[PDB]
Amino acid sequence: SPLSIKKCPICKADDICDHTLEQQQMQPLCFNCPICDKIFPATEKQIFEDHVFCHSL
Numbered sequence: 383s384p385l386s387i388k389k390c391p392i393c394k395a396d397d398i399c400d401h402t403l404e405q406q407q408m409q410p411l412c413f414n415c416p417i418c419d420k421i422f423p424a425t426e427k428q429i430f431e432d433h434v435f436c437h438s439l
């Protein structure tokens with residue numbers, strides 16, 4: 383165990399905001415894109431993130 387409070391930053395660009403520790407301690411089971419109506423399994427979170435990103439880029 384690392385002991386003491388020590389959270390690793392996911393992104394530097396996002397650091398400039400309220401990431402909320404509660405969000406880090408939560409692993410979704412499924413995802414649903416409200417922009418394309420596509421579902422992404424918890425394991426596809428990475429693919430989902432890229433998918434949702436494409437809609438923001």
Ligand SMILES: [Zn+2]
Nearest residue numbers: 415417418433
């Ligand atoms: Zn989509």
